[PDB]
Symmetry: D2
């Protein structure tokens, strides 16, 4: 839809705790109306979820 | 698609650590080809992710 | 030590995503020099970790 | 005590989702009577918690 990222985009956390890897899903709550699941590129199979504002796309 | 759950289904963990609330998203990795994000009904705003085999739908 | 909480204290998240239950552990990193593990009182066996500034003790 | 790992040990997940880095804390619940917090060596500041049986020490 108006989604910021798509499946397979490479993203990282902008600040604080680090995370980097591919978009592998999405979620939506009232607190986080646009959220993404990101599989680490360093730790295959490990997925963490974050609000869109915490993430930025990289090449 | 062939998805087991849809947005808004009420689910719980079958076993081990407990979790219960609404489906709020999805994710797919090689290790977890069908996964869901679940917002707790007890702890609004807190979301955890699980493979489909760990979850069951409730009324 | 100078720890803010002890094992068994009942705590909750102050803001944002909710969580409530007993202190069940601790952790320390450069980003989070004083952190706690909290077992949900609603979802037995489910544990989440947070920095001390995110938590407050309740009766 | 009878703890398997100490602060600063380098550990990894044995199987499934990967994780690797230093022990930075501990937790204890009925479901997980001996658990550890592990800071990723790849993603500084990101910590995940696991039961002792899921982890093994490495050099």
């Amino acid at each position: 839809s108006n989604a910021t990222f798509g499946m397979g985009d490479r993203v990282r956390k902008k600040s604080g705790a680090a995370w980097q890897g591919q978009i592998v899903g999405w979620y939506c709550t009232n607190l986080t109306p646009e959220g993404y699941a990101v599989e680490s590129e360093a730790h295959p199979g490990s997925v963490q979820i974050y609000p869109v504002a915490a993430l930025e796309r990289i090449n």
